Write a protein that binds this DNA or RNA. Structure first.
Ligand SMILES: [Mg+2]
Ligand SMILES: [Mg+2]
Ligand SMILES: [Mg+2]
Ligand SMILES: [Mg+2]
Ligand SMILES: [Mg+2]
Ligand SMILES: [Mg+2]
Lengths: 76, 139, 141
RNA sequence: GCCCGGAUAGCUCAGGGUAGAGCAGGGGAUUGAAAAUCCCCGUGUCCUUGGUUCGAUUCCGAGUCCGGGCACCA
């Protein structure tokens, strides 16, 4: 089954019999103005966030909204 | 109400949903996003699939207008003898092989794109995409 | 790095470094060569560093001809030791190179590749050198 | 850095025509059920990356590293 490598990376279960280590991810939404977007994406890349979605709220003209699934630990 | 940007880009006849670059460039827009899908993946589907871009024009009251063509000479050669890469190490690698007229059909489709309305200069054309994936011209 | 597989004698006297080279003065196997302009005991570690440098430059393609061999053993007393008590121990091998000698040759390689690989390789040796290109004069030899 | 070598399974390891064994495990045999013993079975991206070959753990590079030599190191 499953349980949590708690406040002790040392106190694992035996990585002998192991198949899935799970990070906490998070639904991460970024309201940038204009195409700082270019900067933003490079940042979220090395933070290992998957790009799921982006949407322009037009009007003038900057405003872009980015949605990301990213490992919770990679913020903090 | 976005300006009149001249929309030269590089998209694919099939791979079509609002993941980038469908979004960033077509931000300055307001068009029916799933139309390069719809009309382009359907009306030019006889050839197969693959990459062809699209030339839209945005006008301020959210107006689209686009025309396109033919999957890339490196696709029309992937149906040929069964490839989906090149040959990694060509110049000597003769994986698939074609005849001087089994590579005369492939320009029946990409003919209206170069400047050669002669399917000799349009044969060695698509047969040049051969070498950079290694498929040969027999004897 | 090169050393003889066996020797009649372990230690040998220093000798003089006089004269132009006796032979090996014409490009004999490749298209370009590096020739010595001054005499020297070129050590094996030097030869190895010159070889590798050109190799690295030919990462895909090329033949390297090393036409000098370090057969002369090099002797050195242990440090902080008074004069006497016999001749030092062999601590390495050198090749005696006199001016005019062709030390390295490259083939199978564009002119630019050849004169760049030989230029680096010169920078590894304790002597001034000259890069040369197989001549009718080599063919006549 | 250097000379010798030495990185092959979760671990300790044997070794130019695709490499195994102990071991840990999981399961099984034995038992009333265990311990001990024994059987069975894997993912090896033969340490990483590039090249050499028709064929590389092997050969040529580079990278990081491990055990012994020198050397720096009140
Ligand atoms: Mg010296
Ligand atoms: Mg001496
Ligand atoms: Mg003395
Ligand atoms: Mg001595
Ligand atoms: Mg010099
Ligand atoms: Mg002290």
């Amino acid at each position: 089954g499953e349980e949590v490598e708690v406040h002790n990376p040392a106190d694992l279960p035996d990585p002998t019999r192991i198949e899935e280590i799970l990070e906490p991810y998070v639904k991460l939404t970024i309201f940038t103005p204009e195409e700082y977007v270019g900067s933003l994406m490079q940042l979220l890349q090395e933070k290992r966030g998957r790009l799921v979605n982006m949407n322009y709220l037009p009007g003038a003209q900057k405003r872009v909204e980015l949605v990301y699934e990213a490992p919770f630990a990679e913020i903090l | 109400k976005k300006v009149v940007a001249v929309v030269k880009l590089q998209l694919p006849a099939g791979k079509a949903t609002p993941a980038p670059p469908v979004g960033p460039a077509l931000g300055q827009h307001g068009a029916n996003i799933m139309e390069f899908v719809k009309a382009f993946n359907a009306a030019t589907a006889n050839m197969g699939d693959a990459i062809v871009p699209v030339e839209i024009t945005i006008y301020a009251d959210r107006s689209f207008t686009f025309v396109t063509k033919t999957p890339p000479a490196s696709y029309l050669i992937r149906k040929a003898a069964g490839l989906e890469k090149g040959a990694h190490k060509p110049g000597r690698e003769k994986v698939g092989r074609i005849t001087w007229e089994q590579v005369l059909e492939i320009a029946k489709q990409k003919m209206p794109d170069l400047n050669t309305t002669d399917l000799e200069a349009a044969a060695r054309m698509i047969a040049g995409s051969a070498r950079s994936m290694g498929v040969e011209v027999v004897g | 790095m090169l050393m003889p597989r066996r020797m009649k004698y372990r230690k040998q006297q220093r000798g003089r470094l006089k004269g132009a080279t006796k032979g090996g003065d014409y490009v004999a196997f490749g298209d370009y060569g590096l020739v010595a302009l001054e005499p020297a005991w070129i050590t094996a570690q030097q030869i190895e560093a010159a070889r590798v440098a050109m190799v690295r430059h030919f990462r895909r393609g090329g033949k390297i001809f090393i036409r000098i061999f370090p057969d002369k053993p090099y002797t050195k007393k242990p440090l902080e030791v008074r004069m006497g008590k016999g001749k030092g121990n062999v601590e390495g091998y050198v090749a005696v190179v006199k001016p005019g000698r062709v030390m390295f040759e490259v083939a199978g390689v564009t002119e630019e590749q050849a004169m760049e690989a030989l230029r680096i390789a010169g920078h590894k040796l304790p002597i001034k050198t000259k890069i040369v290109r197989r001549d009718a004069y080599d063919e006549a030899q």
